[PDB]
Amino acid sequence: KVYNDGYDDDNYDYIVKNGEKWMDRYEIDSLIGKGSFGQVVKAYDRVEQEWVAIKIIKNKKAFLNQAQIEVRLLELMNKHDTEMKYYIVHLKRHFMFRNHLCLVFEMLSYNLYDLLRNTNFRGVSLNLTRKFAQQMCTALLFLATPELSIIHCDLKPENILLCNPKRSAIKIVDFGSSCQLGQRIYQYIQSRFYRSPEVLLGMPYDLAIDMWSLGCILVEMHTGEPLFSGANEVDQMNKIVEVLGIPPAHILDQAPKARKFFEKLPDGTWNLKKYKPPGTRKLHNILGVETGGPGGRRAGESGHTVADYLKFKDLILRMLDYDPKTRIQPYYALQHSFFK
Numbered sequence: 001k002v003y004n005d006g007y008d009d010d011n012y013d014y015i016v017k018n019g020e021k022w023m024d025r026y027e028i029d030s031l032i033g034k035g036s037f038g039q040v041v042k043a044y045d046r047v048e049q050e051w052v053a054i055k056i057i058k059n060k061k062a063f064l065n066q067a068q069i070e071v072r073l074l075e076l077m078n079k080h081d082t083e084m085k086y087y088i089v090h091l092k093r094h095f096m097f098r099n100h101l102c103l104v105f106e107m108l109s110y111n112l113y114d115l116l117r118n119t120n121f122r123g124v125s126l127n128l129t130r131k132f133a134q135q136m137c138t139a140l141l142f143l144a145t146p147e148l149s150i151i152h153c154d155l156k157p158e159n160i161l162l163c164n165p166k167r168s169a170i171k172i173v174d175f176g177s178s179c180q181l182g183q184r185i186y187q188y189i190q191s192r193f194y195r196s197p198e199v200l201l202g203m204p205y206d207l208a209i210d211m212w213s214l215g216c217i218l219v220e221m222h223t224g225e226p227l228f229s230g231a232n233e234v235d236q237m238n239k240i241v242e243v244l245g246i247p248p249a250h251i252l253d254q255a256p257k258a259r260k261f262f263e264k265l266p267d268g269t270w271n272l273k274k275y276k277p278p279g280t281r282k283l284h285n286i287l288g289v290e291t292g293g294p295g296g297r298r299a300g301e302s303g304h305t306v307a308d309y310l311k312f313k314d315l316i317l318r319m320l321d322y323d324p325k326t327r328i329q330p331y332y333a334l335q336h337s338f339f340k
């Protein structure tokens with residue numbers, strides 16, 4: 001059985017060969033990552049004399065076209081951030097090679113899920129969480145600039161990479177599922193644990209969905225475990241409500257999917273359709289604000305005082321506002337006293 005004249009496997013992926021030279025320019029070293037899109041290889045760019053990561057997209061039209069969207073968005077961001085100060089991965093160039101679209105990037109390191117695994121799923125310190133939060137809010141501020149207006153739409157620990165294994169600098173990756181505020185097409189979006197209530201409820205959405213995801217990500221980075229680990233949409237919404245309570249009636253009254261999860265009482269108030277009772281799984285206790293941090297494991301550690309935790313909790317709750325019009329926006333998140 002032959003795929004792509006012998007160059008591809010049965011998963012639409014290019015069969016990586018060590019030492020292969022491409023286009024009289026790149027010497028392929030090794031496979032360093034993989035995902036639904038294809039593969040990431042370490043390669044030496046002999047023209048620029050540097051190591052690069054090449055994202056080799058699957059040779060299949062749906063994957064190609066997803067990547068073409070990604071290339072356009074990365075090129076737009078490139079021409080609007082030439083100093084590379086806004087925490088988005090830098091696309092150096094792209095090319096088609098043996099029926100695969102290939103995106104050449106700066107080399108990065110481990111993703112933040114890998115980092116959580118490296119903590120044995122116990123979380124990173126509040127101080128490292130703060131550094132990640134500040135960089136992510138800066139990235140979201142850039143995506144919100146009017147000429148971009150990019151909604152990432154799939155923020156999760158796996159899509160945030162360290163630049164260097166020993167440093168806290170990060171870059172956001174993976175814009176294949178992204179869109180712009182003026183051209184919102186998708187109804188079904190965001191990975192489930194990180195999915196905003198407006199998307200669960202079938203309501204209009206905007207860049208605020210990414211702030212919701214960030215709030216979820218930051219809690220998980222410090223505790224080691226997802227904040228809302230739903231097995232399906234109904235379970236996801238129920239897990240959200242355990243922490244945050246029943247959403248406001250003015251939202252549910254306008255939500256096409258309200259009755260997937262909730263029922264309206266003769267009061268006019270809404271309740272869940274037949275979990276811990278609503279709002280009784282307190283973020284205050286998830287974070288261990290007064291009890292030594294998650295699992296009590298930060299008791300007697302510098303940089304984890306009650307005051308520090310109260311600042312973090314306050315910021316997170318503003319990121320997890322059910323109302324996307326009042327959910328904290330990146331400019332103001334960066335001014336919050338968690339960062340002072």
Ligand SMILES: F[C@H]1CCN(c2nccc(-c3cnn4ncccc34)n2)C1
Pocket residue numbers: 032033034035040041053055089105106107108109110161173174175
């Ligand atoms: F192989 C792993 C170690 C280095 N990596 C790396 N390095 C630079 C860029 C990227 C990257 C760019 N876009 N995406 N999208 C999705 C996934 C990764 C990427 N990954 C991943």
